[PDB]
Every structure is written in structure tokens, then in C-alpha cells.
Design a protein around this nucleic acid. Structure first.
Lengths: 94, 98, 59, 71, 53, 162, 109
RNA sequence: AGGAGUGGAGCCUGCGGCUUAAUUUGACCAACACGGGAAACCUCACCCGGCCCGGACACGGACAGGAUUGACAGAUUGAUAGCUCUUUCUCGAUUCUGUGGGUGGUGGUGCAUGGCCGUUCUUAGUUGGUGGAGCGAUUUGUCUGGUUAAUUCCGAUAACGAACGAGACUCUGGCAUGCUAACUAGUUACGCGACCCCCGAGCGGUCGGCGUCCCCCAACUUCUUAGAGGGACAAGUGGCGUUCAGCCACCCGAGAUUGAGCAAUAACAGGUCUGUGAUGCCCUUAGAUGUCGGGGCUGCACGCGCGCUACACUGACUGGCUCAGCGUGUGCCUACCCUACGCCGGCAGGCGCGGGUAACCCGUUGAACCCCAUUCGUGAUGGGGAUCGGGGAUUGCAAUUAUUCCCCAUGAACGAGGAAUUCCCAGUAAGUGCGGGUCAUAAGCUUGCGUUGAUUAAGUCCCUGCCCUUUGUACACACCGCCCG
């Protein structure tokens, strides 16, 4: 416990106060590191990427893993149309 | 502050006694060992000498990450009245060099 | 002592290096005599910058 | 490297409100001095300073990490 | 003011600093260097070395 | 007060003290005709022989400057108190002292004077004082904002071998 | 070019990218119609009026303006038929301007 | 003439293009495993959030019922940043506020510069004085010839006498039973006593053999170590040359070349403002280009470069035998070294003790290829180990886009490689391991070192390129030139 204190109290707290048969709002984090645990389950957590808080519901099937595996931090990728110098042919103009 | 009023004295009095100060370029010094004993947790030596230097009264060299402040006649007069000291005292040095 | 490092700051051009070396030397003379006259005569009569280390006993 | 782009908030340091000073000692008759709330009990406190009358919270401002009664 | 200004630097390339001005990038330790390779060259004449090979 | 560092590391730390000092002094005694140092540790005492041509300006009136310099070293490298002892020295034959000749040309130039006549004036002195030969270079700008080079040479020179 | 040499004595370069005046008063966007020689060139303005465009100092042999493509043209203060080139853009820059909806949506690249 | 490869295949890494909120940036023979640049954080220049001033000094203003400082809790917040707000104590001339003025910047400009480095250029080139020749730009000296690795010498001579580079020099290798001297280096000799086997003559003792302890007030310095010296000079002989300068063969023997360091004149719009408290000018400077948290430099339908591992029987696999060298190591930077020995575990590893400032301890460095004996059998095979699942350890504040290491399982391309192209002449190429560098954890990289050790040449100007002379030129931004319809 190196001031993971801040997270684990908010989760239990928000889970308690929330109506029955309804999930809480969110607790947010810039921390992408913390083991998913049984007690954490049922909460909803937003996880900072570089700008964006991608929200996720915690399953009992996610236990053992980290938070940061369920939020990506890049666009998967598309292409493309090779550019100009994209080879030993691009050159000349005047 | 800028710094306490205690820690001013402890620099200005120490300078008057050796006639010279030296220090290092850091901002993570924890208590400034190597005199001023354990009551300067920050810049304070460098920050107070610079203001003093702006108004003359001292010269400053710098070489390989170390300052060297040389007190001068004008600052001796200032510091003497500023710290309410005898009209003729210099405990820094006073003898002929052979 | 060997130091094998780049000859070029901000590497560009043909890749070159430079071997520097320092050679130290040690040698020792063992005496057995009273410690007084040794420590008297030893520390004097040395012109160059050359170090000396006296030892109480080793044998 | 390039110049700062516009914010829509920024505010620096609060002005630490310009309250009227010393009404903490109450005079109704002399030589009596009618003190209000208790003066601070620590060894490192001088006990010449007042403690906060901050009800539902009771806190020495000379202290800055310790000695917070609340009832 | 603040309650922080620092975070653990205890190992790595940021907790040692080289003597140019507190320059880096140019990772150096050798035989007690703490001395920057660009200036090491300028101290080939100065004492520590004279070039012989 | 112990123990003591490895013999390999013993020489490196001496070299660092020999070198740092030699650039510390050059930034203060530049106008006094600095020419080097020669350090010597002696029995229970340090000697730092501060070679400069004009010992006058180094000394000062009542030895103020020499007193400043000794107090600096006594704090900076953390020397045991009162062990440090400075000495001065005047060199005779000043035209074989390239370091001082170069730094004198500097203040002649930075004083505001022409380059050609300045280079000639320093040249004949170092030739007169004794020397097989001698050389001067000035590389940088003058008469516009493109750089050039100006060589002034007399006598013999070597460039190769040990 | 295809490498060669003597092309470094002089100021490489490049367009560290960048951005973005307009139009201004008599200073607007046109498209290259033809590609004469000698130096001058043709370019129909985007409004509807034709004009004949002229190259400008610097941009001379420092920037090639192939045929077909948007380009920034000042109009002469008094002259109708002849007009004066400025400040070209990039093909990417021109399609961003088109997507913004500031130049007319009529020409393809 | 040949040797081994690259280009082909899988993988690592750098570069371009594409993508992206950011995928920071320099560099295009003389860039591209290069910027010590193997980036978890730091680094960090980039992107997104939050905080701080470390805005000197001057002048004016504020101002001792006072300029000002800090903070609990609650709310807010990634946050336990009094950052903000609620709440109300605390600090006391250090300040705050306005103007003037500074300061910081991995901000820009290497086409404003210093310094350094690379390259032209590893070739033999280069210059002034006095005299001579020309109206002058210039030229002679610096050469027809012989000779050398070399503007190296001989010789010629309107030039004469000189300087820089070449050489000389420094380091390293190769030759010492000569010299100098050694328990922080050895050898020999016994004195030996102890262990061991008769193993050989004899009996087991002794004599001989095997190492270790014992070794000294023993003897010595061959081996090891490092100092002073000597030795190689074309010296001698035979050919050849003007018989000059030199060249070829041979004796002695270490043959006149073992390998490196240092290196001229003049130049380049070569690289570096991101090594520099080197530096001009410009920009920015409180809503900061100066600090904490998170992400990125690793993102892929593609193109190229440097390398690593392979395609088996001259092999793989499992046992057995037996040899080395250059170094390095805690007491350093701020928290950290190299390891013997004992114990526990299949392994990674854990744990208990001890030494090492180092010819002293690790380490008589008990390394690999190689060597000796089993097993496999021409089969994409047990060759190859890519891809991929699960589990165990170590470093750290943190290991996810798997830091590194280990165990079991999974078992791909690849069966000798097009057009092209690189590098190399003797302990050299090639095979093979090790130390140092970066390093909290980690080399497929670079820099050095040992070990095993060939084939082919003793040449030439064909290609590519360079030096000297002569010749031609509309060229001098110098043929990557100029110029015509």
C-alpha cells in the first residue's frame, strides 16, 4: 500500500451508496497499475491513457490482471498508400 | 519569504568571519552541509549572494560547478553597520603576507 | 590504464578512436633497522613528485 | 517549443481575505481579560496563541500536520 | 507552497550527472571518471595522461 | 581519517586537483600575466606555487589577494585547516611562456587595437627573447560577416614526430 | 533531383510545417491552367476570371510549381490581364482548405 | 590468381514511407549497430493534465487593528497540490502590487562564429630570400637521365644557399644460461618427518617413481618479474649497375618491410548552437520553451543497410579427457564490488560465514573449438529453433505493449541461394571462446585479448582510382562544364 489507499476506499464507498441493481458512476485513475482483485469487482473505473479516460466494468474473470491491459493507448493502425520516397524511385521534379 | 530572517544572518555573519564564501550549484541539497550548518534546505546561499552582488559589495567567480564569492571593501562597511559590529573589526584576515 | 574512446564529438565522418594509456610503476625496498633513523632520513632528499609510504611491519 | 495556447480558467494565488484583526480578547471590565476559546496546548506551541473556534473542527494553525480535535 | 518537488532518483541515467554543467547523455563512470568525453580530450595535455600511443 | 583509496584511483584524483586549479586560476589572474602552476605536497604541508610574470598585482597591498586564494582552497576541496600554504614565483624569460604571450595578445586586442600590428608586436618579442621560431593564428571575423584566417610566422617550426 | 552534388551549398531546408494565410484583399487562390516556359505561367483564378500569372523572386528556382494545383496569387493594383504569384501551398493544405469550405468546391487534384 | 561471405531464408537493429493525440531530433565514397542513442520511470528535446517562481536590482505604491506566510477537515481532484472553494487559525517587513530592468531555455540560425572532428590525401607534395628570364599575369630554383617505398639519393645545371612534409623520432614485437635482485615471484637442493602403492632392484626399509604438507638461519635467479646495457649496419661473399646511387642471390643469423602512434601547404559554404557557465543576433519569458503525474520515441499492406543463427554425417546428441591470455574488482556518486567455502533446491535462486586497497583474495584464472568412447542414419530426420500456451525466480518505487533468467509443452521458414557486390597476403584469412565499455536489472553491438590455423600471389594498368611530364580546350560555379536548331 503506497497510497493505493485513495483508490480502494472510493471503490467500496461508491459501490455502497449506489442504488441496488445499478452500477456506480466512476472513479478515475492515472494509475494503470494495480492488481484486479475480487473486492474491486462491480465497480466502474476510468483509466487515463494519454488524454482519455476509457471506462471499463470490472469482471470477476479479470482478477490477477492489471487495469492498463483493458485500456489501449494507440489507434490500432490503418494504411495507407505508400508515399513518395517510400522506395528507390521517388525523386526529381524540376 | 524568499527565506526566513534567521537564515539571512547565518550567511551574512559567516561571510564576515572567513571573508569568502563558496558553494555548489544544486537545488536538491537537503540541509546544505559544508558549513552553514544544517539550516539552509534550499538555494539560500546563492540566492542571497546574487542580490548582494547586484548592489556591488562582492565579486563572483564560477568554475566547474562551484561558485566563489569574494567580499570587498564596500560590503565590509555595509555588513559592519548592518550587523551592528565595532567600528574597526575584520576577523576575516589582517596581516602582511610574506 | 587503458581508455579507448571516440576521437569525434557528435559522431560523423569515418569512425575513429584514440588509445590513451597511463603507466604506473611500483617498487619497494625492504629494510630492517630502527624505525627512528629510517623515518628521519626517508622523508628528506627527494626532489621530484614521487610518493613514498612507510610501513611499520610486513614480515 | 511553440507559444502557449489559450486557457479558459487560470487563477494563481488566493488573496487570503482581508479580515479585521484582534477581537480575540474581550474586555467587559478591568483588570479582567475575558478569553474565549482555549489557547493551544503543545510544548512546542507557546500557548500565547489562540486555537481556532471552528466548531465541528478544532485546530491549531501553528501546527500544520498534527493536533486536530473535532468535537 | 508545495508538498513535493522530487521523486525517486536512486539509480539510472538521471541520478548520476557529469561535470560539464550537470550534463548527461554521454553515460560515463569509468575508473572514477564523472568526466565528459569531449573535455577529457581537451585534458589530454593536462595531467592524468600524456599521449604516447 | 582513513582508510585510503586504491593506487589506481590515487593518481586520477591528483590529476583532477592539478587540472581544476589550473582553470580556476586562469579565470582570475588573466590580467596579471598568468603562466601556470606547479603543485607539491611536502611533509605535513601543501605547496601551490602560483607562477605568474608580475607578482606585484598577484600580491596586492597587505597581501589581500593571496589571502583570499588560500581561504578559498581551504574550504573548497575540504583541506585540513592551516595545512595549505601558497607561494608565488616570477618566471624569467617571458617569451618562451606561450600561455602568457597568448593571453597578453588577448587583452591588447580586446583593449581595442588593430590585428596586424598587434600580431607583429607580440611576434618580435617572442623571437627576441629566444626561440627558433614562432607562429600566430587568428581565425574568426573581421571586415564583414564571413570568417577568414590570418597566419603570421617567422623562423623554424616542427609538426611531426615525438 | 537524383542526388548529385553542389546542392548543399545553400540552405537545407525544408518546410517544418506550417501555415496559413489566405486571400487577402487582391491576394487570392488560383489553379494552374497551363505551364509556359521562359519563366511566366498561366493560372485561372477560382472566382471565374482568368488572368495570366507571373512568378515571384526567391520562389524562382527554389520551388517548382508543376502543372495543375492550387496556388496563392496577388492581383496587380491596376492591371487586369496579368497577375502576380505569391505563396503557393501544399496539395494536402489545399484539400484541407477545400474541406473547411473557404475556396470554391469545383477543382480536383 | 584465389580464400570466406553479403544479396536468397528466419531473427536483431538502424534508416525511409505510412499511421498517430505524440509516434521528438540530427546525419543521405565522406549518412544508415552513427550522435557511447541496448529509451520501463529518470533520461526527454515530444504529446496531454496539474503545481511552483528559483521575475535580481532600481523607483513608486501598499504598510505595524500591519505588508505578508502556512495549514487540519469537508468539498474538489490521478493526487494525502491550501491548487480551488467552504471553514479560521497561524506567520510578521523576508514580502506583495505597479513600472523600469533582469534571468532561464535540448528555442531558432553550423550559410553569423570559436573550438574540435572528418575529407580532398596515404599519396609525395609545399614555400620564401638573393640572383637570372619576361611589359605583366608568372617562371627558373622544384631537372633530360639513372635510382628509391618516399621532392630518396646519384648526377646534370642560371642558379646559390635554406625551410616544412618524407625519413629521423616515440611505443610495441623478435635475440641474452651476459649484467642488476627478489618469502606481494620461482626453481633447485637437501634436512626432512608424514601419506601412498610395491609399482621397479630389494622385503614393506633403503634406492627409484607420484604430489602435498614440512621447509630453512640452505643454495641459486634458468623459468616469472623490470631495470640498466649489448645486438643488424646492406655488415661479409658472389652476380649486376656509369661500377656511381643502388638492385638480386647466399653465409652467419633475428635480414636490410612485426604492428601502431605522430604528420605539410591550401581548401570544403562537410559535421557539430542537443559536449561546452564557448558565443553573435533573433525569439520566448508567469496562461513560460524553466517542475510533478500519465503516454510516446517499440505503433505496420511496404522499400533498403549493418549483422546474428541455419540449412547437417568434415554432423548433432550424451558421457569421459585436457590446455590459455588481455583485464577487472567493495572502502567510488550519494549507496553501491569481485567471490571462495558450508547448508537447502531439478533449475533460476536462497541462506550462513570468510578474504581481497589487490604478482598478496577471487584465480596454480581447472574456457571453448579441438581430443576419446556411446547413440542417431540421408529421412524437412533427433537437422533448424522461429512462432506460441502454462508455470517458477531475480532487479526495482513500479516490469502491462510480455525488463531479465529458468522449467515443461508447441515445432515454421530454411535442403546452399538471381541481377549484383564486399573484404583479405602470415600466426594473416577463417573457425572458436574470453575481458573491458554502456549497466539498479540486460549484448545478436563496439573495443581489446588468447586458442586452432589453411588455399592462393611474389604480378599488372584491363576495370576503378591516384602521382609526374607533354599536348589540346569556346572550360574557371572548372565536363555533374559549355553550347545549337
Amino acid at each position: 500500500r503506497r497510497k493505493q489507499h485513495s483508490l480502494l476506499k472510493r471503490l467500496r464507498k461508491a459501490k455502497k451508496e449506489a442504488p441496488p441493481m445499478e452500477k456506480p458512476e466512476v472513479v478515475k485513475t492515472h494509475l494503470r497499475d494495480m492488481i484486479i482483485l475480487p473486492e474491486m469487482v462491480g465497480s466502474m473505473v476510468g483509466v487515463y491513457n494519454g488524454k482519455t479516460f476509457n471506462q471499463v466494468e470490472i469482471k470477476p474473470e479479470m482478477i490477477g490482471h492489471y487495469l492498463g491491459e483493458f485500456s489501449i493507448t494507440y489507434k490500432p493502425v490503418k494504411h495507407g498508400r505508400p508515399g513518395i520516397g517510400a522506395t528507390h524511385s521517388s525523386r526529381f521534379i524540376p | 519569504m524568499l527565506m526566513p530572517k534567521k537564515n539571512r544572518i547565518a550567511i551574512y555573519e559567516l561571510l564576515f568571519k572567513e571573508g569568502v564564501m563558496v558553494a555548489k550549484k544544486d537545488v536538491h541539497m537537503p540541509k546544505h552541509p559544508e558549513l552553514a550548518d544544517k539550516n539552509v534546505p534550499n538555494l539560500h546561499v546563492m540566492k542571497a549572494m546574487q542580490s548582494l552582488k547586484s548592489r556591488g559589495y562582492v565579486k563572483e567567480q564560477f568554475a566547474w560547478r562551484h561558485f566563489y564569492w569574494y567580499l570587498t571593501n564596500e560590503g565590509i562597511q555595509y555588513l559592519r553597520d548592518y550587523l551592528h559590529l565595532p567600528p574597526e573589526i575584520v576577523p576575516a584576515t589582517l596581516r602582511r603576507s610574506r | 590504464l587503458r581508455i579507448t574512446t571516440r576521437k569525434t564529438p557528435c559522431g560523423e565522418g569515418s569512425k575513429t578512436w584514440d588509445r590513451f594509456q597511463m603507466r604506473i610503476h611500483k617498487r619497494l625496498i625492504d629494510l630492517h633497522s630502527p624505525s627512528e633513523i629510517v623515518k628521519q632520513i626517508t622523508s628528506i632528499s627527494i626532489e621530484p613528485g614521487v610518493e613514498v609510504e612507510v610501513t611499520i611491519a610486513d614480515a | 517549443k511553440k507559444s502557449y495556447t489559450t486557457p479558459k480558467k487560470n487563477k494563481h494565488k488566493r488573496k487570503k481575505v482581508k479580515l479585521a484583526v484582534l477581537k480575540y480578547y474581550k474586555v467587559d471590565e478591568n483588570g479582567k481579560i475575558s478569553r474565549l476559546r482555549r489557547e493551544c496546548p503543545s510544548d512546542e506551541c507557546g500557548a500565547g496563541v489562540f486555537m481556532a473556534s471552528h466548531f465541528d473542527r478544532h485546530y491549531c494553525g501553528k501546527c500544520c500536520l498534527t493536533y486536530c480535535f473535532n468535537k | 507552497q508545495q508538498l513535493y518537488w522530487s521523486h525517486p532518483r536512486k539509480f539510472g541515467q538521471g541520478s548520476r550527472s557529469c561535470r560539464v554543467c550537470s550534463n548527461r547523455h554521454g553515460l560515463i563512470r569509468k575508473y572514477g571518471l564523472n568526466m565528459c568525453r569531449q573535455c577529457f580530450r581537451q585534458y589530454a595535455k593536462d595531467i592524468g595522461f600524456i599521449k604516447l600511443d | 581519517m582513513a582508510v585510503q583509496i586504491s593506487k589506481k584511483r590515487k593518481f586520477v584524483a591528483d590529476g583532477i586537483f592539478k587540472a581544476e586549479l589550473n582553470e580556476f586560476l586562469t579565470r582570475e589572474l588573466a590580467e596579471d600575466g598568468y603562466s601556470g602552476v606547479e603543485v607539491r605536497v611536502t611533509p605535513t604541508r601543501t605547496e601551490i606555487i602560483i607562477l605568474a610574470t608580475r607578482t606585484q598585482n598577484v600580491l596586492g597591498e597587505k597581501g589581500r589577494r593571496i589571502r583570499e586564494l588560500t581561504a578559498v582552497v581551504q574550504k573548497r576541496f575540504g583541506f585540513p585547516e592551516g595545512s595549505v600554504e601558497l607561494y608565488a614565483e616570477k618566471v624569467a624569460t617571458r617569451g618562451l611562456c606561450a600561455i602568457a604571450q597568448a593571453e597578453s595578445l588577448r587583452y591588447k586586442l580586446l583593449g581595442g587595437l588593430a590585428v596586424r600590428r598587434a600580431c607583429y608586436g607580440v611576434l618580435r618579442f617572442i623571437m627576441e627573447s629566444g626561440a627558433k621560431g614562432c607562429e600566430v593564428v587568428v581565425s574568426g571575423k573581421l571586415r564583414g560577416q564571413r570568417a577568414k584566417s590570418m597566419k603570421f610566422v617567422d623562423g623554424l617550426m616542427i609538426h611531426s614526430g615525438d | 533531383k537524383g542526388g548529385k552534388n553542389r546542392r548543399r551549398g545553400k540552405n537545407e531546408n525544408e518546410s517544418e510545417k506550417r501555415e496559413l494565410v489566405f486571400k487577402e484583399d487582391g491576394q487570392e487562390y488560383a489553379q494552374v491552367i497551363k505551364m509556359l516556359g521562359n519563366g511566366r505561367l498561366e493560372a485561372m483564378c477560382f472566382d471565374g476570371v482568368k488572368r495570366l500569372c507571373h512568378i515571384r523572386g526567391k520562389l524562382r528556382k527554389k520551388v517548382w510549381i508543376n502543372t495543375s494545383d492550387i496556388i496563392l496569387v496577388g492581383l496587380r493594383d491596376y492591371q487586369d490581364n496579368k497577375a502576380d504569384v505569391i505563396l503557393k501551398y501544399n496539395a494536402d493544405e489545399a484539400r484541407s482548405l477545400k474541406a473547411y469550405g473557404e475556396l470554391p468546391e469545383h477543382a480536383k487534384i
